[PDB]
Amino acid sequence: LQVTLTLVCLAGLLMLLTVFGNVLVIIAVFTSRALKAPQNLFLVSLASADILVATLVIPFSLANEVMGYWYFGKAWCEIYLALDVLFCTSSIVHLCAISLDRYWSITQAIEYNLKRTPRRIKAIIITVWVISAVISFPPRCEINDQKWYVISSCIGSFFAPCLIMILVYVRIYQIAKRRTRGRQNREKRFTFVLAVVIGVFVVCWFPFFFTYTLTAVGCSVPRTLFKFFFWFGYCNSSLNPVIYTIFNHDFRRAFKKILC
Template sequence: MEAPRRGNGSLGVSRGYSWGASAALAGLVGLLIAATVVGNVLVVLAVRSSRALRAPQNLFLVSLAAADILVAALVMPFSLANELAGAWAFGPAWCRLYLALDVLFCSASIAHLCAISLDRYWSVSRAVEYTRRRTARRIKGVIGAVWLLSALISCPPLLSRPAPDGPPGCRLNDETWYILASCVGSFFAPCLVMGLVYVRIYRLAKRRSRSLSLKPPPQPRRGASRRNSVDAPDARSGRALDLWAAAASSRRGREGSVSGGGGSSVSQAREKRFTFVLAVVMGVFVLCWFPFFFSYSLYGLCREACQVPEPLFKFFFWIGYCNSALNPLIYTVFNQDFRRAFQRILCGARAGRGQRRRRGRRRGKPQQQERFLP
């Protein structure tokens, strides 16, 4: 039996599928590709069109969505064709490029999540200082570095050549050093960094919340305005950590924290909700890709003695691809700003005007003024 192949998710050349099985598999993968493209395009449009989602750090989500779209457009169709045909039929040049793109987009996805985790940590540990320095230009520079690092990781498939003997296929270098290096560099090392960072965020938020609960609230000086007392750096940093701890515990607690503060606390509460959502995104990514990378690295260590059955390895491989379609669903379930933006995009301007009219009625505005709303 051949070595596991990163490029097509197969342990060996396929023996062929019946017409019914081929149609079913093509239909499932077609739905996966469509869901990935549509969902991530909605993410890009939501960040660009929604005022609540225009924060610079959300550029990470746009770039991550772009990587998922490219996976669906440039990798999944060829993986499906290779699986159904049982052999690579697109030539050695495209094989090398296809393998490099597969490694590139997977590495870019986890590198984005790693950069996002560090951004969340700095926004919690240095709330005031880091928020002032976090600009769209800096975020774009970090995104560029993420893609450059991912491109360097994906270079070996471009430089290697397929084996001249054996059945026609498209597979990565089968040497142990490359298998282990690619698994560590593309998955295990970034996962370790993200795990340590989020543990640090949790401990920092918990410690600050405990200290705030034990300390009585400061009394404002006579003559000091409420706005000045709310916007003090120490209070703002402490409240940010407290709101993040509430966000991790329950949604009701998060909403209660938001309703009790001013404009600054609302924006910080939204940022901490994003931290919670992105922690879920990271967890789902690890769950989707861990089985593949674990079984692939086991094969690199002990070869046939640790090789998983072919159908199971294929399942692990395609579960990893499913992760590209899950992020928009996570945003929809856990973040109300994305839900509202998706509804506005899907339902159109008419639904948006209807929502504004309903809000105007609740606020007691005259109905004659509603027709002048944009």
């Protein structure tokens, strides 16, 4: 009834926002000369992953949710469970790679800068895609649930990158604060940027993974919150581009140039 139309419109708006943002980032990375650099390829990979995940699984997930029924057989649905894991676990991991690159660029400037060639970045992109594939492809229309592989995959997908990224940003916060021993601007903006990044990432993903993990051994699932956290997680795909693009000055310049 009416509610179904509201949910469909919400999902379509989410898909449109995701595609708009990620395609904008992709076009910005190439057309510019200042952005053109060996480090920015990570953003292109992340944007492509977001476009794919949105445009493919948001329609299928919406159909499986609103209808609560199966309409694609026993294989076209399992190739979906896998695609969901591949397209998300690859989107989560690209956050860790960018943070590690930033940390290495900050702590050891000259040494890492000597090796900031496109070869290393392309190798890193290929290997993160490989890790996502190897964790994804190895295995009505309900998500997969059993005792052990749930824990293994969740630890390999989220708990590791979350830990890595929170350290990588706490250390950079400490370095930024210490190097300065605009009074208001510096510390306030350091804190705001890092808080925004970590907060959006964690609030978006952690709830779903926490509940999923709980499902493995305990129950801890009253009802109807798994779907809420599911939709949060996809919304994260649209949250990521703005969070990783707005602050950078050159990206803002390119966005303004392409806007008008």
